[PDB]
Amino acid sequence: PVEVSQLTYNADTIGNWVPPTELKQTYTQDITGLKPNSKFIIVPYMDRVSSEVLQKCTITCNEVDAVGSISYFDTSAIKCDGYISFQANSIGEATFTLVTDYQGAVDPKPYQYRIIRAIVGNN
Amino acid sequence: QLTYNADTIGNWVPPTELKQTYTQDITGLKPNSKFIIVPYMDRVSSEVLQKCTITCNEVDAVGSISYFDTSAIKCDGYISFQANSIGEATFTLVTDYQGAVDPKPYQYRIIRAIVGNN
């Protein structure tokens, strides 16, 4: 176990949300390979050319106690905001709900996420 | 035991010149505690290519943050740092904006692991 005086944050795990294939879509996505039963926070980041066709995406976890929503929007009024604080399950997984409303969706570029883990205790 | 607080948000002070290097102190933090600051965005693009890059002046801090609001959107990076004994941390901002009439600030979110005396 890591003493609080040696606490560090690992923030180098990044990934992509699978893009939708319809203009309005609700779906889920699993993230996998996490330390089992650890506490994490997932935050949005962006390095992404705007589609300029109003690609709105909201992510949440329907577990009570996974707290927060993440919002993405790429057209003029840029959103890359929110967070979700969650605990990975006993096999190192978590699931998220995505709700997308895109005004165009030919071959959309994924929105992007970063997972942060405090390395302290046995987390 | 371990929970995160991620609701502390703030603004980076905007530049007064087209090309600028300046510092900003974030204050009010728990003295000596360890944090990670990430960029976020909730902001109308200027469309005038407002580029901002941030690094931390504190001893042993690590990372860089980048912002860019025009076509190729950047809201990226992170800095992991320790607040000083006063509850402050100093950052260096490098800005290169193609226009700069009353610019909207770029935005940050500070994450703290609430564990032990952190």
Numbering used by the authors:
A (entry chain B): 4 to 126
B (entry chain A): 9 to 126
Paper text:
A major factor that limits the expansion of shrimp cultures is, however, infectious diseases from viruses, such as P. vannamei nodavirus (PvNV) and M. rosenbergii nodavirus (MrNV), which have inflicted heavy economic losses. The Nodaviridae genome comprises two single-stranded positive-sense RNA that encode the capsid protein for viral capsid assembly, the RNA polymerase for RNA replication, and the B2 protein for host RNA interference suppressor. While the shell domains (S-domains) of PvNV and MrNV contain conserved sequences of 62% identity, the protrusion domains (P-domains) and N-arms show low sequence identities of only 17% and 43%, respectively. In this work, we have determined the cryo-EM structures of T = 3 and T = 1 PvNV-LPs at atomic resolution, the crystal structures of the P-domains of PvNV and MrNV (PvNVPd and MrNVPd), and the crystal structure of the S-domain of PvNV (ΔN-ARM-PvNVSd) in the T = 1 subviral particle (SVP).
